[model samples]
Target: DPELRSWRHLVCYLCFYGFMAQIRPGESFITPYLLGPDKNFTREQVTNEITPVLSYSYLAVLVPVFLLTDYLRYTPVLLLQGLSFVSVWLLLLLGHSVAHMQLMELFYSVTMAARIAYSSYIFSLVRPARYQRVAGYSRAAVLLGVFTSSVLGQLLVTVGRVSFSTLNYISLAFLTFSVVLALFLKRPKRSLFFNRDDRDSVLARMLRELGDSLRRPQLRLWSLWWVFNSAGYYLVVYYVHILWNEVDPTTNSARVYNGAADAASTLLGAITSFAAGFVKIRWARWSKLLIAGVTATQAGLVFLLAHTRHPSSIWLCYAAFVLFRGSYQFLVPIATFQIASSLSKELCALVFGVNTFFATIVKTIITFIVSDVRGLGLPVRKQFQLYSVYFLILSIIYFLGAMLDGLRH
Candidate 1:
């Protein structure tokens, strides 16, 4: 049988190499080029408004992609994973409209969606013995890949012909990386197989179970926070990048650490969430009061971020976003675990997503008013002011809910 030896490890490294190498330095460099003097994108809203759609499209795309990824679960899907990025960057070459630039980001999200294949692809190839190894190997590959690609790309882009070197950097690493790696990996031992996901029936039962659990007061309140509190956190978290471009009106690529900042925001969110996992609070009745208070403090941070307009306040960036991320990240996993510990082992996973999608529904309205110009035509500063008020409003409701709970019980 061909199901033996180096053949197993070889395909994994091949997948790992190609999977990690796919970041376009252009991804970091491209936004500034369009927003700043690098291109002929005439509409000013394209700078701010164009960015938020990535959130919308990504949220929208993920649901269907899970369906289709499993549905296609076949040969043609592989072509599209590499093809997704090719479609993403090529828009920059052929075009310059606010309309199609949206397409670039729309395409950008599909790459993330397709990554589902690469990530899960490792498991089917390896023996059960090697699952944990390739699993961890793929995880580190993506992290270091994005980090290393950005480190050099940023180094190269800061030079005057900004795009050229990273263009070289991208071509240098990826082309050879893709062609050379896949060539030797050898054929998969025999194609693996899948079955009907039975998703329709699974979710139908889940909703009925979900409804029963919602009657539980503990999860009910946490569901409230999970859906409402973190909706703001997500919108607040993502749109912080929008404001990054806001206060700085002039084009100065020298200080444009956008690539690194994207990575930094991710790092901060993760570490804060990671640090949060170790905490073991009893979450007694007073937990509601603390949650209300945390929401209050975050509202203040948003107000400070909006009210302040000058740059040397790196602390402004650090305090508002970092503390906000830390606090929000702090609540998220605990709130989730709290909800689940009270109920089903698996339903909590479903509960987590159910709460999330509703929050997505909530975020759609806020982004409509604050982010999409069709709704507000508001500037970045004004939008975030409303955001503080939005969170401020959320905290008041939380305060009222806590008050009533204390008095009655």
Candidate 2:
């Protein structure tokens, strides 16, 4: 039974994972690279104004991309994403204008949309019986990529001593490699990409699917779960550095601590993802474990970090970060699998598109709140109170998702 699951699915994920590893250096560290020795911009300025402006633009571009992806082939989207990813970095390395950064932000949106589309497309490839395994495997690839990127990024910066332009060029080369790899993929003969039986226009069909997805009670519950967890996810991602900086502003303390934490997190995620592949039907069990594990771990970590000011406290914070990150990353794909498996094969991409659309809308709302919250100039301890609130919200959403799992399939 396990061997019959589908090797084609596994191969696709392997190629994608390798490609992502090569390209992720720019994404994970771009803000820090821009603000630190690379640009000498202050942390406060980078977080407060630059990041928010960029995030809003990212949300704006997702609207069109989400709509278009429902009808478009995955290959073209991947090609465009590759081109734009390279272009953005090229701008970052060369352009000095504020306008260029905004442009980079827009291209980053393209990258996000393309990635979501690619994932949805991939999920549509096999039978629904294997959706859980496929989703888990794909997430495993992501964590593996994250791990590779971490090591590669450290080497590139430390040993290669590559500057911004050189690093951008490297990313460009990797994107091209990814495109080439994707070209050789074997699409399903019966896929939406290969067949032409439908008569509806892109806009009309997207509107229909949008309505259809909304009418699904299971989808609504999953969307709520995704939104809450995603908000917490972003809060942790965007604020970890702030926590580090509060502890130590100079000597690259934040970068060092966060990088170590990320490495640990990725490793944990990789292990758990592999485990998830073997326990697809046990989602209910893992879902509860993940929710309690991640929230409790995160709350404890924040509390620990908040109470101590010692330099060594950073290590404790790093350990906590690693634990929570693993829990969240593993749980995320598991949750996505649960939601996605309920839809028909033809509805996979459309449903995911709709899911992504709503999730972004929620993220936008939370981004605003998070921005305002950070602007309060509250003490680190008080800021951590906000972090606890985020985890608690995630717990509530998980509970909601549990209630709706009965509606699955």
Candidate 3:
């Protein structure tokens, strides 16, 4: 009975915080507003300096926080996440310097890392049999949060009810609520890493377990897909607003529909993610083909986005891109959880951390290549063209991988 009660409390905290976590009303327009005439930040500064910091910082702290998650249990890390968001919004609201904004991005990365801990926390609270059901609820809660926040953002700005500065304050209020929710969470009674009986050093044991998990072919394949998919996904996400601005520059001084687009994307993504549960795929048989198809489709959409000059067409392509992106979000965890079913809870977290670490690295590299002046040096339009080519190459590579697998079978 106590165990059940504990499980219930954990799920309640997770769902509530998941809802609070995504109430970022400013996210859809923050970049453009910051770089626009009001803030006077150059495109180069935001793209090259500020945005890359988030990816690099995420790469830097992912593992250390993973270890800390298991060592300290989950609640404190979550609380730190809330605190980091508070700092992020505070800086966005009041701070003016480039260095100040970079610091804000750094804390935002900490918030992202804390999300990993939160996802893994569910494992600590429930039996393996309940993982799917509980995870679905948690994910649905987050999607609902994103949807609601995006809609609220659209309404606020569309109706001229709040300025961008006011939106940040609203986000700050929601994040404060999340912090309070974290304080009420009970710490997990047992941790796979900290409570182990083995005499081996934690690092040594961690390495051993990581190596063992990597030996599984299914895990390796899924992790590889995770890395590339995440890299491309974030690349487009971080800059889609720029694409929107370019395609519809006439709307520069007018009321922008960025928030409405975001709301539509999240709503569609939410539906697809939920629908993914009813879909079935034989990972060993079809995953490679699926990966190839998804990557190629995304590449084509980006290419279409680049070539199209019409505002409506660009919006359509962008929305399509977001839809497929949502599908991948659903697909990745299904594959990972399938692999994790065979491993200990601690090992699952380690595997996820390792994969995310590698993903962040890939993301950072892509960011530099696309966003840095010395790298591509291209404007937003050319950048999306490059992304199209980038994913096209990925599509070809995965197609070859699929062919090889087909031969082996």
Candidate 4:
């Protein structure tokens, strides 16, 4: 029988509404604005120099933020993140030089760390039975937010008086609202994972706990797969606009094409996510393979995007990306939640922290490498060609990960 939908599920979905809005816009697009419109930097220089430096700073911030999450409450961390957005938006609005852009990126990185923390916390709260259904809702919210923000950013520039800095003000307003809302959220009494009070002093506890979590072979394998897949997703999304611009230099043309791509991706993600809900039940025993198949599809999309120059060809590539992303969202949460359910509540936080730590470290390294490669003197087409290698590597990893899952069974 079909599960009866209820008002309670709607409330659970709405709970994640704010953080979903912040994640993609702040994490991925703001850099494009800084490098593309605000700073007047070329796509190459911005990709190579600007975003990498900021990402490394974000990686650095995560360590302290994760530890602090253990010690302090989640809402305060969320509110502080909101304030960080306000500060960075102000800097972008008023700052006049390259130095200011670099400074703005630093603070921007902090805001992103907060966003990730918010995601981790939200995932923690979701009851195990509802993980798939809730994740579908959450990811839909994410896609909705990305669609809204991306359209808003594009719309802001269509008029004459506003610059990207003006858009930052808009984003800041959203963040501020999120912070205010955080105040009303009832903080769970126990940490979502551990369900425990602080048993050891801060530093000692983090070190000891992380060490123990790292020894889990399953977590280690999944984390590795997560890193490669995450990197692939970021690489295409962060630079797809740049790729579009290379083919269509006119501002209107570029925006239209990119907008279409986003719409396509979102549409596909929504459809496939819903489909996965059905498929997951029938193939519960084969959940691991289902995830790997989705990842492999994502890698294929990257390859197609890199190789094809025809505009019509891009639509196919976009479709591939949609399937890739949709499948990932469906599968990854199932795997993560299974691990969390198996763990003693005492180790939950440590497992999530270590899992994400490994993922972020990979993202930081990949950002630098991709940025540096884009910075090279080759033409834009050649640069994208270089990116194909990264996607190829991702494909191999996804295939290998699937094999690992097979062996485990």
TM-score of each: 0.74, 0.73, 0.86, 0.71
TM-score of 3: 0.86
- Tens digit per residue, CA lDDT, model 3, 1-409: 8777755666776788778877877777777667766566776677767777777788787877777887887778888888998898888878889998889889988888887777767767666788898888887888788888878877877775577667777878888887888788767666667754444666786678777777876777778877887788777877777666666653243366677778777776767656655543444457678778878888887787777778666567557557656656666655666567567656666676667778888887877777766566567778888788988988888899888878876
> Which ranges in model 1 have alpha carbons more than 4 Å from their true place?
1-30, 40-43, 47-49, 73-82, 111-153, 158-208, 280-290, 339-353, 406-408
- Model 1 collision count: 0
Model 2 per-residue lDDT at 174: 70
Q: Tell me which of candidates 1 and 3 scores higher on lDDT.
A: 3
Q: How does model 2 fare in lDDT?
A: 0.60
Worst 10 residues of 3 by lDDT: 276-285
Residue-wise lDDT of candidate 1 within 1-409, one digit each (tens)? Answer: 4554454566456546645545556565565566666555533465356766765776787656544554454223444555556666566655567878788778766665566555545555556697787666676666666655555566665654456423544643463445355344433342332332222455576678878877877677788888788778777755565566565544666566655654554466567656656652555457677678889988998887787777766447645676676667667666866688656524654565577668867877777766777777677677778879888998988789888888876
lDDT, model 3: 0.74
Top candidate when judged by TM-score against the true structure: 3
Give candidate 1's root-mean-square deviation (CA, Å). 5.1
Ranked by lDDT, the better of candidates 2 and 3 is 3
Task: Name model 3 segments beyond 4 Å from true.
Answer: 1-14, 126-136, 195-215, 250-254, 278-283, 311-314, 374-376, 407-409
Give model 2's TM-score versus the native structure: 0.73
The Cα local distance difference test for each model comes to 0.63, 0.60, 0.74, 0.58
